[PDB]
């Protein structure tokens, strides 16, 4: 699922609650900076809740955290 | 209540080559 339409780029937008799809991984959260160190051989990570807690950009090499949006 | 996202970010890896 690496090629879909015009959406190949979609320049990143941080510090906002957004529904995101990274390399076929659906999800919605808040994008923030990440001080946690990951192995470059990996892809992403999850928490004990079986939900993705952080992501890695396929193009540029970076670590980003997924913060759950405010709910009630 | 739940906050609804107003924008969608979908980003895919770069294309080195394709499968014809």
């Amino acid at each position, epitope marked *: 699922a690496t090629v879909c339409g015009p959406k190949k780029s979609t*320049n990143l*937008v*941080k*510090n906002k609650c957004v529904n995101f799809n990274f390399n076929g991984l659906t999800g919605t959260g808040v994008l923030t900076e*990440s001080n946690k*160190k*990951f192995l470059p051989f990996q892809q992403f990570g999850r928490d004990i809740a079986d939900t993705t807690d952080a992501v890695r950009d396929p193009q540029t090499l970076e670590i980003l955290d997924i913060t759950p949006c405010s709910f009630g | 209540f739940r906050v609804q996202p107003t*924008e969608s970010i979908v980003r895919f890896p770069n294309i080195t080559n394709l499968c014809p």
Partner: antibody
Amino acid sequence: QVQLQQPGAELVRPGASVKLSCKASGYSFTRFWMNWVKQRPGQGLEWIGMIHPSDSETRLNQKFKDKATLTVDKSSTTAYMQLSSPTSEDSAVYYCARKDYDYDAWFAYWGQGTLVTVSA
Amino acid sequence: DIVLTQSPASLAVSLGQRATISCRASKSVSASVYSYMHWYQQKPGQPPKLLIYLASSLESGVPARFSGSGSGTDFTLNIHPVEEEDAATYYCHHSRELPPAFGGGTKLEIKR
């Protein structure tokens, strides 16, 4: 080509209101953030706040909290900024800069600038 | 939040020498084996411009005589060779924590 435009200067009397226009061209206005920077000569740089044109949500400094006011017009793709009772201490040049995101965030583009002077 | 401190407030560098400007931060902005810093060049009557992003990469369109790097809270901006067109005020920035803050600024003087 991405280009930003602002008026040259604006005059205001103490106690009145101000309106600053920032015109966007060559890119989607609602997708990216819009930041305002306060340059007071001799005081260096100061950060005002950002606004997201989509939902009209604002992140404002506590120093400018309750004073500055942000709003956007999605029809003409023009961002506005308003100040409450500009005083002599509020006279300065204001820029509207695009914030581009590749990993870390930096300011790629800037506005022509608008000189604000409060006098009778 | 995070506050930036630059010293000296003004620097005078002649032609051919090397210019060193330090941007000190209150807390460490380094994350993911990267750090958040940006340098800006402003001239009188002109808006600031982008010089070097993430300290490790030179922006397209900027001459190669500008360089820099650093780790932790103390980063340096190196200039060599110095030219007559380099006179300006410089600024450092951090996007690490909201709200972002702006550097104090440093005025550059060219000796001759």
